[PDB]
Amino acid sequence: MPMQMFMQVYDEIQMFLLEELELKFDMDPNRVRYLRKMMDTTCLGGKYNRGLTVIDVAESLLSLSGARRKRVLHDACVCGWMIEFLQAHYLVEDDIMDNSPDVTVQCAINDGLLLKSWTHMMAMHFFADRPFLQDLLCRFNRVDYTTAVGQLYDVTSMFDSNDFAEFTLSNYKRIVKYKTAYYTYLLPLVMGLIVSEALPTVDMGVTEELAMLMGEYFQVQDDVMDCFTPPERLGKVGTDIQDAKCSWLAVTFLAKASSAQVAEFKANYGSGDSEKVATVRRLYEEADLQGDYVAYEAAVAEQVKELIEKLRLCSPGFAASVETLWGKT
Amino acid sequence: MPMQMFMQVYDEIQMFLLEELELKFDMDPNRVRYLRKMMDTTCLGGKYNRGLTVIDVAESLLSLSGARRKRVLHDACVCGWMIEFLQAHYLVEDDIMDNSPDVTVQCAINDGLLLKSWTHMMAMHFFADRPFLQDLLCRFNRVDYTTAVGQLYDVTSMFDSNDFAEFTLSNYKRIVKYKTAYYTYLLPLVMGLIVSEALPTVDMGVTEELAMLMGEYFQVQDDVMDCFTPPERLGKVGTDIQDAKCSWLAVTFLAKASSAQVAEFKANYGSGDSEKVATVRRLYEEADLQGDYVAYEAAVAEQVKELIEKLRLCSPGFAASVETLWGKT
Ligand SMILES: O=C(O)[C@H]1CSCN1C(=O)c1ccc(Cl)cc1
Numbered sequence: 145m146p147m148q149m150f151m152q153v154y155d156e157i158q159m160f161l162l163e164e165l166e167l168k169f170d171m172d173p174n175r176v177r178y179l180r181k182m183m184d185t186t187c188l189g190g191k192y193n194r195g196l197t198v199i200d201v202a203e204s205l206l207s208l209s210g211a212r213r214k215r216v217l218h219d220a221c222v223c224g225w226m227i228e229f230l231q232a233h234y235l236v237e238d239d240i241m242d243n244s245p246d247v248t249v250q251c252a253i254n255d256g257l258l259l260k261s262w263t264h265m266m267a268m269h270f271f272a273d274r275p276f277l278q279d280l281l282c283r284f285n286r287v288d289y290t291t292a293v294g295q296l297y298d299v300t301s302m303f304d305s306n307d308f309a310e311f312t313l314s315n316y317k318r319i320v321k322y323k324t325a326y327y328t329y330l331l332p333l334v335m336g337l338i339v340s341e342a343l344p345t346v347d348m349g350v351t352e353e354l355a356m357l358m359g360e361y362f363q364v365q366d367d368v369m370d371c372f373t374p375p376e377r378l379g380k381v382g383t384d385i386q387d388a389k390c391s392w393l394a395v396t397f398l399a400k401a402s403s404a405q406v407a408e409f410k411a412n413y414g415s416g417d418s419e420k421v422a423t424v425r426r427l428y429e430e431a432d433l434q435g436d437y438v439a440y441e442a443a444v445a446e447q448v449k450e451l452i453e454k455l456r457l458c459s460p461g462f463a464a465s466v467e468t469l470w471g472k473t
Numbered sequence: 474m475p476m477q478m479f480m481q482v483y484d485e486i487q488m489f490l491l492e493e494l495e496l497k498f499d500m501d502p503n504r505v506r507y508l509r510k511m512m513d514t515t516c517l518g519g520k521y522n523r524g525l526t527v528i529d530v531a532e533s534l535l536s537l538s539g540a541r542r543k544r545v546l547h548d549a550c551v552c553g554w555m556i557e558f559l560q561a562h563y564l565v566e567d568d569i570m571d572n573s574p575d576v577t578v579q580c581a582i583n584d585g586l587l588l589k590s591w592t593h594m595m596a597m598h599f600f601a602d603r604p605f606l607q608d609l610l611c612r613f614n615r616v617d618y619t620t621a622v623g624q625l626y627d628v629t630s631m632f633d634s635n636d637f638a639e640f641t642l643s644n645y646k647r648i649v650k651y652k653t654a655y656y657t658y659l660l661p662l663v664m665g666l667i668v669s670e671a672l673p674t675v676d677m678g679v680t681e682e683l684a685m686l687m688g689e690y691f692q693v694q695d696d697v698m699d700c701f702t703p704p705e706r707l708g709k710v711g712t713d714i715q716d717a718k719c720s721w722l723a724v725t726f727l728a729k730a731s732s733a734q735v736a737e738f739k740a741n742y743g744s745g746d747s748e749k750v751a752t753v754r755r756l757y758e759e760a761d762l763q764g765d766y767v768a769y770e771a772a773v774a775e776q777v778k779e780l781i782e783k784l785r786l787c788s789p790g791f792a793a794s795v796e797t798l799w800g801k802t
Pocket residue numbers: 365368369372373428429432433434435437
């Protein structure tokens with residue numbers, strides 16, 4: 145029912161956007177079918193955890209505060225696809241960075257602009273008569289701005305914006321917070337509370353604190369899998385060492401490494417050579433970072449498993465969905 | 474006074490955006506100064522015709538409908554910088570297309586996202602208590618979506634989105650309309666009417682018709698200068714022939730060219746070779762396209778000089794600014 149309804153609204157959203165282009169933007173059929181294929185390619189195929197989270201929050205709040213149920217459930221599906229389209233927009237922007245008049249790059253940039261604008265068009269249409277339309281766009285635009293700021297922190301974590309000084313645990317948390325946590329964990333929860341009209345009925349401080357901790361828990365495991373999980377099992381090629389990313393493994397190693405090991409780390413980090421990357425993996429393994437990885441995640445999980453209770457003392461139905469979201473993480 | 478006030482509000486807008494990053498987004502001073510330089514580099518230096526148009530429309534409507542004058546004039550300056558920042562966003566996106574982990578491309582993409590988001594942040598702040606905040610964002614987002622659709626029409630005018638069939642005058646007008654006319658001419662006028670609270674007091678059909686005709690007049694002259702004005706006088710290197718653009722010269726030539734000249738045109742168009750481009754210029758010159766250029770622009774100017782009168786019979790102060798805008802074109 146949740147996944148099935150989420151896909152039916154996708155067809156409804158896609159049909160409106162494409163017909164709007166045909167009826168109001170003078171678009172020819174060839175380009176409409178071209179944009180249908182691009183939308184399906186970029187927006188479909190993932191796990192839809194961000195979009196389904198908006199649905200799961202909405203169904204938990206209508207059970208504990210007829211005609212309003214079906215409306216809120218439909219509004220949550222549109223908000224779910226706003227985040228999915230936003231995620232597709234971020235992924236397209238990432239492809240342009242590593243892929244390199246070249247018409248394929250021109251279309252890639254155009255795709256990224258259309259996916260972002262489509263979040264506005266589908267919101268301005270299906271929420272035209274909603275009282276929360278203005279507040280929804282402001283929180284959506286602010287979180288999107290937050291993500292772009294977090295991408296600046298992540299991209300420039302190894303240089304001086306006109307370098308391992310910013311390779312600290314507090315700065316790692318800043319990167320995870322702005323680049324990932326706000327739009328992946330906090331935004332689906334907020335949009336689920338907005339369509340359920342129960343936004344001022346929750347402790348936002350505890351909610352934000354959980355979103356950052358869940359994103360932190362997810363990112364620490366992600367950095368670890370990027371380094372040791374093989375490509376055919378991870379689904380991609382791990383490249384954090386070659387890209388000199390400010391990963392959890394790097395900032396944790398630098399805190400417990402000897403003075404001579406840091407020299408060996410700095411001399412091998414950020415290189416595409418197969419053995420310098422293997423040297424970094426060897427340093428991570430010998431420093432017993434795997435033992436700290438289990439302890440760090442357990443402590444974060446303890447903070448998560450205990451922070452949901454503060455949220456249920458004032459909003460019980462909200463906490464049920466955060467546990468399901470944490471169960472996915 | 475207009476240009477001087479427009480620059481004072483820029484300092485006010487820039488100071489808010491940068492302090493917000495410092496105070497609310499945990500940004501370090503090094504990146505704040507980095508973003509100050511990027512903002513100045515991308516948003517300053519142009520002619521500010523889009524931004525000043527919002528000011529000129531606002532001052533003409535407060536003279537023919539104390540505390541409300543200074544507020545509307547300030548609101549028009551913020552709306553003027555929204556379009557300038559939006560224009561800077563489009564230009565950055567254009568640089569990424571022709572410029573080619575590469576950190577300079579990562580920062581270019583990040584710059585384009587920040588410039589766009591900054592239009593939302595400066596609007597959500599200075600217009601927080603304005604009743605038109607929701608309507609302003611919707612018309613702004615829709616025009617931005619329109620521009621991205623027009624860029625699709627322009628980029629794919631020579632191929633079949635998975636070719637000279639689309640090299641027609643009606644499709645040329647569609648490209649100019651969506652890619653340029655809506656955000657360069659219509660949007661500054663609409664935003665000037667919104668801050669002056671006189672949006673429903675104008676004939677939008679005549680206003681839209683003037684924006685398309687003025688953008689058409691501007692683009693026809695632009696395509697002509699791109700082909701024959703030398704680089705040191707044009708300010709850039711004309712590349713429409715090499716890029717196989719759907720320019721006014723191309724669609725006009727194909728209508729009055731002989732069957733054998735079209736073969737010579739198709740065999741030389743869209744090539745970087747110095748003589749194939751000179752062959753295209755020779756074909757444009759021999760076809761007497763310069764004589765049609767003066768006649769076409771005169772006819773458009775006649776349509777412009779006569780359409781402003783329909784607008785003044787119902788909105789006299791609005792027509793005074795459209796003439797000043799047309800005087801710039
Ligand atoms: O996430 C996991 O449980 C699995 C996924 S693959 C890596 N991994 C580890 O626990 C790990 C192995 C070596 C080091 Cl040095 C640190 C962590």
